[PDB]
Amino acid sequence: MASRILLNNGAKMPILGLGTWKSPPGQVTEAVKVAIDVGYRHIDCAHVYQNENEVGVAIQEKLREQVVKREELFIVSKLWCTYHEKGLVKGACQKTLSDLKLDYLDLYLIHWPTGFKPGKEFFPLDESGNVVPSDTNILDTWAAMEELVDEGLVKAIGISNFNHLQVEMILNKPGLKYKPAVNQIECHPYLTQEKLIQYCQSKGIVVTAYSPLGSPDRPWAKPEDPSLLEDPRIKAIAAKHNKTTAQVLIRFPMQRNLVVIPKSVTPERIAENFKVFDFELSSQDMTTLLSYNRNWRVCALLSCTSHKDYPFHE
Numbered sequence: 001m002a003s004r005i006l007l008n009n010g011a012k013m014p015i016l017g018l019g020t021w022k023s024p025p026g027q028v029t030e031a032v033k034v035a036i037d038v039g040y041r042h043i044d045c046a047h048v049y050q051n052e053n054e055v056g057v058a059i060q061e062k063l064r065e066q067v068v069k070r071e072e073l074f075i076v077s078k079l080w081c082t083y084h085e086k087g088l089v090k091g092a093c094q095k096t097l098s099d100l101k102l103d104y105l106d107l108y109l110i111h112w113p114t115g116f117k118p119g120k121e122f123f124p125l126d127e128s129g130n131v132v133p134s135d136t137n138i139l140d141t142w143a144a145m146e147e148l149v150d151e152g153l154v155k156a157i158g159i160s161n162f163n164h165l166q167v168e169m170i171l172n173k174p175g176l177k178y179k180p181a182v183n184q185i186e187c188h189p190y191l192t193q194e195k196l197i198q199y200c201q202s203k204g205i206v207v208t209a210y211s212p213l214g215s216p217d218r219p220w221a222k223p224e225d226p227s228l229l230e231d232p233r234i235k236a237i238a239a240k241h242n243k244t245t246a247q248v249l250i251r252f253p254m255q256r257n258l259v260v261i262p263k264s265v266t267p268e269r270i271a272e273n274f275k276v277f278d279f280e281l282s283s284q285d286m287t288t289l290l291s292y293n294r295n296w297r298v299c300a301l302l303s304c305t306s307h308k309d310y311p312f313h314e
């Protein structure tokens with residue numbers, strides 16, 4: 001297992017990163033400092049998580065303390081849906097850069113293929129509760145992303161939550177200048193994503209798996225929901241290898257040539273979750289984990305199911 005994967009912009013991306021969705025602002029600075037001390041070199045961030053300033057304080061202290069050089073870190077953030085307009089993308093990017101205390105991002109993603117009306121609210125609602133869309137299509141948002149590369153604010157651009165037809169629309173864009181480097185999508189044994197991963201990998205797009213532990217802290221968790229970390233069948237594989245269930249769930253995407261971004265704010269789990277370079281799942285174990293697919297999603301963007309660009313009807 002090499003620690004980095006080559007992207008189609010010629011850069012190398014660490015295959016294990018730290019997620020930050022739902023990491024409280026008062027705990028995420030210490031989470032990111034511990035993560036960099038124990039070897040993480042990739043941090044996954046987003047404006048909509050509301051904690052980039054505190055992530056930035058950690059990154060800046062570890063660079064100032066010379067624990068790591070900026071060239072060895074791989075920092076990812078995401079353009080929120082209310083900034084898909086051409087004239088708002090650069091300012092959105094620069095606000096994230098300012099918050100993270102960086103002069104460039106390694107990777108900037110379109111967070112969802114769905115544009116929303118610009119304004120203060122992240123989810124602008126009509127008087128009945130549906131998201132109010134923006135008319136800007138995703139090909140014009142991609143052109144604005146390409147401008148960030150050419151202005152030196154980001155080294156790579158990519159997409160998140162795009163379905164195969166929407167990846168294909170980018171790939172077929174008239175005048176395309178930069179292909180997406182990454183598609184970040186939900187992926188774990190209950191949502192194995194075979195077809196979309198094979199499409200993206202055949203096009204030289206690297207896939208990042210989010211919610212690899214099934215996001216047990218997601219706000220809308222219902223107790224009858226499936227639970228990966230408590231699945232006896234996955235616990236049995238972990239027991240066979242003398243590893244934790246989280247370690248098997250992190251190693252699983254790594255052996256599919258995916259990047260994976262487990263979140264934790266608990267120092268012991270941050271360190272545990274990184275100790276996955278020392279064991280191998282067999283091909284039989286990988287096929288057995290793939291057989292648990294149920295097409296179950298943590299993140300279904302339920303308020304947007306009528307948006308023209310909603311990704312999950314397909």
Ligand SMILES: NC(=O)c1ccc[n+]([C@@H]2O[C@H](COP(=O)([O-])OP(=O)(O)OC[C@H]3O[C@@H](n4cnc5c(N)ncnc54)[C@H](OP(=O)(O)O)[C@@H]3O)[C@@H](O)[C@H]2O)c1
Pocket residue numbers: 018019020021022044045111160161184185209210211212213214215216217229244246247261262263264265266269270272273298299
């Ligand atoms: N692109 C997108 O639209 C999108 C959507 C969802 C997620 N993501 C990214 O993906 C990251 C990961 O997904 P996620 O946050 O949904 O969930 P996750 O990584 O699947 O699960 C996080 C949960 O697992 C717990 N946990 C972590 N390590 C553990 C361990 N060793 N043992 C037991 N429990 C453990 C964490 O608890 P503690 O923190 O209390 O330790 C937290 O409750 C996000 O943080 C975000 O960066 C992106």
